[PDB]
Amino acid sequence: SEFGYIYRLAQDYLQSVLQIPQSGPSKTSRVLQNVAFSVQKEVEKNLKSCLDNVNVVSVDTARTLFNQVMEKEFEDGIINWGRIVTIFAFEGILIKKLLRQQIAPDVDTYKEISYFVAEFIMNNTGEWIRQNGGWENGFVKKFEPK
Numbered sequence: 001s002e003f004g005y006i007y008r009l010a011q012d013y014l015q016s017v018l019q020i021p022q023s024g025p026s027k028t029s030r031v032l033q034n035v036a037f038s039v040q041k042e043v044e045k046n047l048k049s050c051l052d053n054v055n056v057v058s059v060d061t062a063r064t065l066f067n068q069v070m071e072k073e074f075e076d077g078i079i080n081w082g083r084i085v086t087i088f089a090f091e092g093i094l095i096k097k098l099l100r101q102q103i104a105p106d107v108d109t110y111k112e113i114s115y116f117v118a119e120f121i122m123n124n125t126g127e128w129i130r131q132n133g134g135w136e137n138g139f140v141k142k143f144e145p146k
Contacts, residue, residue: 003118003122006121007114009088009118009135010113012032013029013033013036013088014091017091017096018095028140031140039088039089040090043086043093047093051093051097054097056098057102058103059109059112063116066116066117067120069090070090070124073087081132081138081139084139087125088117091113098113
């Protein structure tokens with residue numbers, strides 16, 4: 001269940017951004033939440049003028065924004081863990097804007113962002129992640145505290 005692992009990571013991060021609790025997150029998820037939230041703060045400010053002109057009134061508004069930023073993020077076809085962390089950071093920006101701006105607020109639609117985030121990661125970086133050690137021998141080894 002490669003997709004399921006990524007979905008849980010994406011859901012864990014969403015729940016941490018939304019400050020809602022839970023068993024608890026894995027070591028991998030804990031390391032990711034720390035690094036992604038750091039990247040999220042930068043992206044929110046470096047992308048401030050573009051996000052202000054986007055009002056995330058629906059999930060499909062968030063998905064469209066996600067694709068335009070993510071297909072750009074991997075415009076040149078190079079993958080690194082820094083760019084994968086930035087996917088999660090952008091998921092956090094989108095759930096913040098959706099909570100504030102969704103026309104018909106529905107907490108049950110929030111997890112749809114985690115789903116399309118996991119589909120993007122799996123379908124566009126899944127092979128690279130595998131070949132570079134996976135989440136436990138690649139990502140966590142690089143980013144966990146030394």
